[PDB]
Write a protein that binds this ligand. Structure first.
Ligand SMILES: NC(=O)C1=CN([C@@H]2O[C@H](COP(=O)(O)OP(=O)(O)OC[C@H]3O[C@@H](n4cnc5c(N)ncnc54)[C@H](OP(=O)(O)O)[C@@H]3O)[C@@H](O)[C@H]2O)C=CC1
Ligand SMILES: COc1cc(N(C)Cc2cnc3nc(N)nc(N)c3c2C)cc(OC)c1OC
Length: 186
């Protein structure tokens, strides 16, 4: 297994969702970037693994489920089997990760990407070792009911730049947003 990464889009008030939806109107290019970043494998014949909670899986339209070209794993404690369309179910982040390290997916997975929700982000962010946070900062306030945890700048450094990530302000539906990359190693 390669790289452990987190990807999230957050509003200025740190909101990541509302009533199981996105707090903002859909942003086609922000989704394009989420798709490209998670699907792309930096090693041939390998696939990226996408880890998400139960609410995140149920938040993507059915037609877009499962995310194509990636291994989808749902993190749940109540589910007995993966939702329909899903490929793996783990009870925890640590179990999801051990599965990687099985001859099963062993030879199969390149990078591991955590795509939501808060509880999932909150624990990855505390998982020790190397980690990168891919943050899309949606530059306005939006009514939200679920937030991204606080980024500890004493541990995560904002990268001045990063290969294949635009550095300037983006704008869609007259909504301004920018791409950020933070790295930790502890
Ligand atoms: N803007 C962005 O970038 C993103 C926005 N969102 C949005 O956020 C909301 C979905 O969010 P969120 O509420 O935080 O919920 P989750 O997606 O993270 O789902 C919650 C459930 O997932 C399982 N689970 C979650 N964490 C763990 C764990 N660490 N170990 C085991 N099982 C776990 C549990 O199921 P159980 O009860 O079943 O055991 C828990 O109740 C919607 O609003 C969604 O659209 C989601 C992702 C990214
Ligand atoms: C409303 O339509 C859609 C909603 C979603 N959801 C809400 C999940 C979603 C959306 N954007 C993200 N951005 C980033 N930057 N990181 C994430 N983890 C994202 C997730 C996790 C995902 C979609 O395709 C993946 C989608 O296609 C239309």
């Amino acid at each position: 297994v390669g790289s452990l990464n987190c990807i999230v889009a957050v509003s200025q008030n740190m909101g990541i969702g509302k009533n199981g939806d996105l707090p903002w109107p859909p942003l086609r290019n922000e989704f394009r970037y989420f798709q490209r970043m998670t699907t792309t494998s930096s090693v041939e014949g390998k696939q990226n693994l996408v880890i998400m909670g139960k609410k995140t899986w149920f938040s993507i339209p059915e037609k877009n489920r499962p995310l194509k070209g990636r291994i989808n794993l749902v993190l749940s404690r109540e589910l007995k089997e993966p939702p329909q369309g899903a490929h793996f179910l783990s009870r925890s982040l640590d179990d999801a990760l051990k599965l990687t390290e099985q001859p099963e997916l062993a030879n199969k997975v390149d990078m591991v990407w955590i795509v939501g929700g808060s509880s999932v982000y909150k624990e990855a962010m505390n998982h020790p070792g190397h980690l990168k946070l891919f943050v899309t900062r949606i530059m306005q306030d939006f009514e939200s009911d679920t937030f991204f945890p606080e980024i500890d700048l004493e541990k995560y450094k904002l990268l001045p730049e990063y290969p294949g990530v635009l550095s300037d302000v983006q704008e869609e539906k007259g909504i301004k947003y920018k791409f950020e990359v933070y790295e930790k190693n502890d």
